[PDB]
Design a protein around this ligand. Structure first.
Ligand SMILES: CC(C)CCC[C@@H](C)[C@H]1CC[C@H]2[C@@H]3CC=C4C[C@@H](O)CC[C@]4(C)[C@H]3CC[C@]12C
Ligand SMILES: CC(C)CCC[C@@H](C)[C@H]1CC[C@H]2[C@@H]3CC=C4C[C@@H](O)CC[C@]4(C)[C@H]3CC[C@]12C
Ligand SMILES: CC(C)CCC[C@@H](C)[C@H]1CC[C@H]2[C@@H]3CC=C4C[C@@H](O)CC[C@]4(C)[C@H]3CC[C@]12C
Ligand SMILES: Nc1nc(NCCc2ccc(O)cc2)nc2nc(-c3ccco3)nn12
Ligand SMILES: CCCCCCCC/C=C\CCCCCCCC(=O)O
Ligand SMILES: CCCCCCCC/C=C\CCCCCCCC(=O)O
Ligand SMILES: CCCCCCCC/C=C\CCCCCCCC(=O)O
Ligand SMILES: CCCCCCCC/C=C\CCCCCCCC(=O)O
Ligand SMILES: CCCCCCCC/C=C\CCCCCCCC(=O)O
Ligand code: NA
Length: 382
């Protein structure tokens, strides 16, 4: 029963989280700094996210411990302590959304990617996102707060001085802000947009892969057609099919040998020399073994690497949602069901701890899923 015992557990757990969030995310920043292979726009958003998680350990967690005491404070000071974590969560959402878009450009418009997506533009986007996060997270300080309706019975019972309140989250931060503005508009909508981006990434990868396969099968089918010695009409028609595919494959080294060899055979076939056109087409089986098989396999593995990277990013976004959703959902109960008894205090604190735990997990996901990070972590730890 004595409040200090339960508080001791919660504070201890918070501090353990803070240590881990600081240490793992410092390692992330260190790895990007040290390894030029990791210096790319995608990972500038990774660093912005790690910076947000570092600040969860250095500031948000000390603020959360502080506000759990209900200490007397000027209400607007209390608001800052209460809301600063919403800045960090918002910055995390922007960084996650940026990463998802980045991976979409990369898989969907790779020709243009490095042209569109530069480190200087990325740095500007990150600055903007941080500014917007401050404005979203600290909106209660602009007047959308309960500071005009203080709980004077709590204030008095705690001994607070004139004009102070007991600094408690749900006393000062309006739930309509938390539910409608923060959760629905600022969190859930970005998360649904993120989900839509990832679904478009995986559909674009699957489509490009199937086209690689279709274009390859077309080459091989049209060859068997030619060997089914029909008319010059046939050979011609199969070679035209092959040439088109060959450009879809190229347009999308030895493609010149390939298209030349097709053109050579097309001339023979357009001149009614079926057997020499057939003989001419058989040289294709060699250019295909020596060049086109190789281009296909490399294109396949480049794709898979990008699917792999996109899944890693999606995992991080999904873990952000898992960790933060319980708090938002509880707030919905508090707001929408005044007839419901309030979620109990142990559960509130469990949900807070769970949200903070999100700031620990990304460095593990990078180490398990991204060899360049893992390898750089290892060398740093030495
Ligand atoms: C660069 C970093 C380390 C700066 C951190 C500054 C933090 C700790 C400062 C900045 C603003 C400060 C708050 C400003 C106003 C008040 C109201 C007062 O009645 C109680 C203290 C309280 C709630 C302060 C607590 C400490 C505070 C949150
Ligand atoms: C440490 C370097 C990098 C930055 C400087 C941070 C300084 C200015 C911060 C760190 C901790 C802060 C203090 C934390 C707590 C309180 C109690 C509050 O009732 C009044 C403000 C006061 C006294 C803060 C004043 C500003 C403060 C001293
Ligand atoms: C892990 C993620 C994906 C889902 C988590 C769902 C959690 C947050 C849900 C599942 C069951 C829910 C509880 C069901 C019943 C009540 C009683 C009500 O008087 C207050 C809210 C409270 C206590 C709910 C709080 C939120 C709750 C704990
Ligand atoms: N509802 C809520 N409460 C708290 N702390 C107060 C927990 C509490 C709730 C009731 C009470 O009588 C005493 C303490 N922090 C909170 N943080 C958040 C939050 C951040 C992001 C989404 O929700 N919600 N939230
Ligand atoms: C009292 C709270 C305010 C004082 C504490 C410091 C506030 C820090 C605010 C914003 C930090 C933004 C850092 C973003 C790092 C970007 C990483 C990158 O360059 O890719
Ligand atoms: C961030 C690096 C700089 C060092 C941080 C400064 C250290 C401040 C840490 C804790 C502040 C403790 C405030 C509580 C004491 C006041 C209690 C009271 O008498 O009412
Ligand atoms: C290397 C140091 C790492 C830890 C730094 C922690 C910085 C402390 C940040 C916020 C503490 C805020 C506590 C406010 C106490 C208010 C007390 C009062 O108003 O009476
Ligand atoms: C590391 C720092 C972790 C905790 C930081 C600050 C805790 C200070 C709590 C506020 C002191 C006043 C409490 C009270 O008077 O009831
Ligand atoms: C860190 C930079 C500035 C810290 C300012 C702290 C102001 C605390 C005032 C609290 C009060 O007087 O009620
Ligand atoms: Na985060």
């Amino acid at each position: 029963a004595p409040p200090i015992m339960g508080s001791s557990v919660y504070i201890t757990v918070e501090l353990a989280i803070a240590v881990l969030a600081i240490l793992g995310n410092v390692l992330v920043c260190w790895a990007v700094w040290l390894n030029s292979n990791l210096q790319n726009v995608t990972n500038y958003f990774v660093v912005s996210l790690a910076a947000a998680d570092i600040l969860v350990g250095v500031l948000a967690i000390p603020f959360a411990i502080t506000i759990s005491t209900g200490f007397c404070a000027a209400c607007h000071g209390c608001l800052f302590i209460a809301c600063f974590v919403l800045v960090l969560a918002q910055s995390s959402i922007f960084s996650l959304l940026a990463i998802a878009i980045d991976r979409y450009i990369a898989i969907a418009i790779p020709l243009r990617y490095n042209g569109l997506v530069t480190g200087t533009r990325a740095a500007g986007i990150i600055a903007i996102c941080w500014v917007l996060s401050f404005a979203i997270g600290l909106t209660p300080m602009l007047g959308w707060n309960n500071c005009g309706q203080p709980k004077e019975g709590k204030a008095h019972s705690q001994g607070c001085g004139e004009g102070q309140v007991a600094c408690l989250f749900e006393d000062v931060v309006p739930m309509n802000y938390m539910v409608y503005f923060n959760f629905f508009a600022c969190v859930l909508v970005p998360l649904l947009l993120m989900l839509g981006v990832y679904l478009r990434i995986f559909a674009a990868a699957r489509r490009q892969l199937a086209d690689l396969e279709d274009n390859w099968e077309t080459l091989n089918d049209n060859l068997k057609v030619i060997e089914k010695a029909d008319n010059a009409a046939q050979v011609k028609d199969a070679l035209t099919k092959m040439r088109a595919a060959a450009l879809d494959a190229q347009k999308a080294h030895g493609f010149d040998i390939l298209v030349g060899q097709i053109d050579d055979a097309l001339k023979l076939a357009n001149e009614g020399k079926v057997k020499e056109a057939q003989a001419a087409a058989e040289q294709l089986k060699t250019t295909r073994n020596a060049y086109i098989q190789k281009y296909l396999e490399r294109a396949r593995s480049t794709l898979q690497k990008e699917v792999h990277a996109a899944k890693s990013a999606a995992i991080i976004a999904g873990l952000f949602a898992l960790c933060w959703l319980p708090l938002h959902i509880i707030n919905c109960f508090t707001f929408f069901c005044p007839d419901c008894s309030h979620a109990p205090l142990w559960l509130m604190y469990l949900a807070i701890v769970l949200a903070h735990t999100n700031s620990v997990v990304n460095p593990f996901i990078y180490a398990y899923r991204i060899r360049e990070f893992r390898q750089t972590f290892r060398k740093i730890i030495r």
